[PDB]
Design a protein around this nucleic acid. Sequence first.
RNA 1: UGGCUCAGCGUGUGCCUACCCUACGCCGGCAGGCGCGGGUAACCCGUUGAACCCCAUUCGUGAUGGGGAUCGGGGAUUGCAAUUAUUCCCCAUGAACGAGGAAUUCCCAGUAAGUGCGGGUCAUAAGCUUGCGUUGAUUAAGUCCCUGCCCUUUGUACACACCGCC
Lengths: 102, 64, 189, 75
Amino acid sequence: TKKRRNNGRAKKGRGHVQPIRCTNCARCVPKDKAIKKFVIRNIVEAAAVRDISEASVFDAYVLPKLYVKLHYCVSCAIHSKVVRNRSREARKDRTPPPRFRP
Amino acid sequence: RVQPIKLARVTKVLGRTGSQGQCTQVRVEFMDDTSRSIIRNVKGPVREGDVLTLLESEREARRL
Amino acid sequence: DIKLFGKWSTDDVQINDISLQDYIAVKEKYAKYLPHSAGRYAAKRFRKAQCPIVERLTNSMMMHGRNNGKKLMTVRIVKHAFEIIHLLTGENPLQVLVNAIINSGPREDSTRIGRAGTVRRQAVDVSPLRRVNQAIWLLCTGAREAAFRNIKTIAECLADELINAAKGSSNSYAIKKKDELERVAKSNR
Amino acid sequence: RDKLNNLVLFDKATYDKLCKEVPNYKLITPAVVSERLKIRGSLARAALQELLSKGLIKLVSKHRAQVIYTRNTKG
RNA sequence: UGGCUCAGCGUGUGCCUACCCUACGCCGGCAGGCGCGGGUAACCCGUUGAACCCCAUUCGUGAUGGGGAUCGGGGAUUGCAAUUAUUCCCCAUGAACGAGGAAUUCCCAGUAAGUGCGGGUCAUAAGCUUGCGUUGAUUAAGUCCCUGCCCUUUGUACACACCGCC
Ligand SMILES: [Mg+2]
Ligand SMILES: [Mg+2]
Ligand SMILES: [Zn+2]
């Protein structure tokens, strides 16, 4: 059965879509098909900030970040458990999951 | 040259770990430096406020 | 003050480390005339801690089949042994025992499940309660194994087990298995 | 470590060893003197009760299985 | 080896159906035997004087005074019937076995284990079983790793249902 009207990709008016290799398994994936992560991590640990701030020779030395763009085929994405299967109704919504800010 | 044995006091219990329970994860602070506080996983029964031996400063640190 | 076995007042002994200061139970609060009590200490977690450590050693000294219920034989051999260590050292037998407990307690260990390098994989330091529990068992086992095919008795075998642990000469099975543990834990960091 | 084959009874070279150095150290039992002088152990009980009648060795415990003695106060 | 010193279950004389539980005294070294009773039972066995253990003796690290396997001789009870040895006692030989591989069972406080005692099976009876009692710990107050279970989601070409199908 046609599981998604989306057909698992964003290709609507496009005839062809250039491919992008997976980061983990190193496999070609269609570009809009692959789930794209944009991690902005701390360049240090959460607990390393206290030790770094002492060694830093600047008083108000702001902490750099880590701007990495990640590409996952759904095989590596499920293995990393970044995406999960949803029910038939729960599959429909396209909003991002909550950000856990508070 | 080598780091001698020091002591640290458990303040809070994080939860179980080791996928069997034989290791419990807790948060400790060092009696030598109260501002110095890390997270250490221990084995055996632990309550809040006790103090335990430590043969090295930092081995593992992670969040469940 | 309590004069355990009629002598050896408990008010003189001390624990040299504060990780064990509140995890040994020879204090004046836990000062008992006799190391025998059906006090139901083990019906709850964090309740064997206040059980007198002399009571705990007495309980842990009976093992291996023919000796699991026999407690009067254990208390008497404990009494014989404590006079033996008091004679051989000149000082308080509880101080002989307490030094044995501290010096034989394995400060760290290691425990994992998956594929391991030699024995274990990751090193995890033990709790002070585990330090006392393992030291008591290791001292008891050293006496138990030393008295299996030799003319020596339990009290004297326990005496050298406590003494070699208290001073430290790598003759106590309680410290020898402790250091054998510390080697593997450090190497598997 | 195949046999101990201790002498059941004393000879001249061990009778004097028992009576010149055994009542010199505090830790004395039929067990300890057995691993020092290489004696049987039933004879050791007989010898110890001899030395108690001779009066050079004090008693401490006197139990049916763990009978212990000691040296008198030195100095 | 001798002395000391303690339990709780629970049971006992028969329609058919013959067969109770035993105190005490005498004989025999013991297994047993002979009379004087009691109890159809909180009335007698029975203050159920059990074992463990407690205190002293000998043993003394040897396949030993551990071990009692195997086997010989003798004596007693039960039953018509004991040989293929019903059972028990006594004198004898004293075997393997010196803590047990890969694997694997049970268990969280009066538990395991030691330890005996009832009931059933019974003319004869327990290494079993069902219950009771004495002594009484270690570690743990957790996890889904190995083994399974429950709820939800999901895929299935399974529906005798994965030991499926193919
Ligand atoms: Mg499909
Ligand atoms: Mg196309
Ligand atoms: Zn991939």
